[model samples]
Target: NTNSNRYEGKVIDSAPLLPKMDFKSSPFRMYKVGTEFLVYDHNQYWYKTYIDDKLYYMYKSFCDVVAKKDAKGRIKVRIKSAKDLRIPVWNNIKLNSGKIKWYAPNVKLAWYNYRRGYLELWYPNDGWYYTAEYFLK
Candidate 1:
């Protein structure tokens, strides 16, 4: 079989004829650096940021959080990724550094699949990053 290859199966449709919304319309594009508590995508996009001992919120559809170093040598973090329908729980997965790193050695992006009821966590080095929970709906 290795020396001679032969095709015996009929050709079949392999591509889906559907709209590509989730990946193309990613909400991440609306965010920018140095933005604080800005509403993104639309007025319904609510967000908050802490600065100078004060908290602020914005009603916009786009926003982005940057990683910074804190007094404890940990990277100050809030959140990253596009179209996060729900507030995400933050964690440091890097083995050597406790500090939060964004767009660093690697970045994990998450999105909610309305058809699936569960939240998905896409991690590095995992095959088929999408989890079954994401398709619960």
Candidate 2:
């Protein structure tokens, strides 16, 4: 009798690539599957995401920022928003699963998806990337 509620067996065959923590942002590279890549930022903390080349998604580390009104009375300050970072989505997706939902209290996760790639963002205390369905295989 089948006992699997979710898709069982290894969905991915290769090893998932973790982002580099070094202080340098690697050049933007094109990826399909079965390959590893790195990214670095000289002035900022670096994070990474892995793609299974199966489901279109990617994830990164959760960053904290503080923002407030600037001297010009405009909402300007150091804030952690998707606008400052490069998202995997070149366009948009239909179903916004994972961490797409906004204002999700205790979310501890975030993700993005596009035509070619996806990103899955997770926190250490909430959910680690290695435990995801795509990485264990």
Candidate 3:
């Protein structure tokens, strides 16, 4: 079944894997942000990943969407949107306004740091990690 846990992988690109070829069916299945998967093969252009031990090819653009261990050591995947990048602040602290470069909608938050009143955020998309931060106030 395509929806089975065995069909998971990160999507790395929006472009078709084979642009010049036309086919009636695709051998791959689309997976969501939180699907559990393992990296079987790392590719500069495409990734060969697996879910439940089943192999699948994924685009390089959505590589950030794969599952990862959290602080609690539980495997999880978190997808963040442009709105999620905004940090809430208290009135006591000031925030430095900046531009939000357009990112693919399925980008995933990779890591974050908080200290005193400062906050840092990270997200991966298109083979690059994007960063932003604000004061906790």
Candidate 4:
């Protein structure tokens, strides 16, 4: 498949569903990282993920674009350094990496059942770029 304006994302841990695009709002809830649910949308920093069963935002770094609801791939790669969540992580308006490093807060296990060729987790604000090897199904 190819890139689209909107795609499905899966959480790798219990993630906060940020209600604001500015990362300044109280979390709607800690979204459970599992199927039955998927994050949609690809905002530059705030992806239209997390479900109030309606719609909310999750940091792009905190989730991965699922390849499918069944096929499995994981970006739960070891949480490294655990840096800032308020700063931008990806570059360009394209949301591709190769510029910075900032991971998510809190860590745990989960399975991503999709692949967008690249896997993104809770990095800095701008987000991250990944590859097939970036995640193993």
Candidate 5:
């Protein structure tokens, strides 16, 4: 059985090209099954529900975590809302799953001491073109 609060949907139509995160651009493709779109907040993932076909960003305070058994018959805490993203303070670190939007004339940077991988940077004018490579060895 599926959780009553879990959100799911099937892709009806997606933009031929994914646009950058902006007010005018369609950062996320449109959906048909549901009125809300899952978006990645700077800290964690959050849901953005469309109101009358207009997108609005609201700050979610907390949610519910109901205990349930998974397919493997293992007990799992099923996250039912935006509160799941409230991970422990110690768990927060770099290179975590999140969304980012960097506009022209502005850039963001991060540094790591250990051997790291490359970061993909996209340019709207000609698509992704830059890579921020860290320690390769």
Candidate 6:
């Protein structure tokens, strides 16, 4: 939700803030989240956010989304491990309906979570809510 209808979010904690399309080694910079930058580029786990008046990305798990209300984009991901685990369900986030045992498969990719990493499935009826980089195949 950037480049146009951008909202705002505050940095609850500080962490490494990377550049768009840049890797970890490219630009080594750390940010003091709450202490600075009253706002960010709306919200996106791995997307671009402006910090120090510069475009960068950070660990969404360390910060919280605020001052905006918008459903996130959908992304398809694969499961690497065949471990049947209990996954928690959330709506918009926070409003969870407990955890459900999901039988994971490594054969095909599926919808991912909405936090930490990767993506979040925007299912209204059942918020599939999470998918991380390590969680994918």
User: What TM-score would you give candidate 6 relative to the actual structure?
Assistant: 0.28
Per-residue CA lDDT of model 6 for 1-137, tens digit only, reads 33232212211122445564322123335444342323344355444555567876644443444435335432222112123222222333332234432323332334543343343444467655443223233
lDDT score for candidate 6 against the true structure? 0.37
lDDT of 2 by residue, 1-137 (tens): 74232222322222223233311222233232323233222233333433453222122332322334346433211213333322221112222234332321122333322222233334466452222323212
Answer with 2 or 5, whichever has the higher lDDT.
Answer: 2
Whole-model lDDT, model 3 = 0.33
How would you encode candidate 3's per-residue C-alpha lDDT over 1-137 as one tens digit per residue?
44221212221322222221221124345344334443433455445544465655544444444465556443233323333322222222232223333334334333333332323333244332222221111
Instruction: Give one digit per residue, the lDDT tens place, for model 1 in 1-137.
Output: 43122112211111111121222221222322233332222123344333455544432222334445455443233333333312222232211123322222113344344343233344465422222221111
Best by TM-score: 4
Candidate 4 at 80: error in angstroms? 12
Candidate 5 lDDT trough over 10 residues, lowest sum: 9-18
Ranked by TM-score from best down, the candidates are 4, 3, 6, 2, 1, 5
* TM values, all candidates: 0.18, 0.19, 0.28, 0.36, 0.16, 0.28
Candidate 4: stretches off by over 4 Å: 1-13, 32-36, 49-53, 68-137
Cα deviation of 66, candidate 5, in Å: 7.3
Each prediction's RMSD to truth: 16.1, 15.0, 18.8, 16.4, 19.0, 17.0
Q: What is the TM-score (0 to 1) of candidate 5?
A: 0.16
Give the Cα RMSD of candidate 4: 16.4
| Count of clashes in candidate 1 | 11
* Residue 82 shift from truth in candidate 2, angstroms: 33
Model 1 root mean square deviation, Cα atoms: 16.1
Regions of candidate 5 where Cα sits further than 4 Å from its true position: 1-45, 65-137
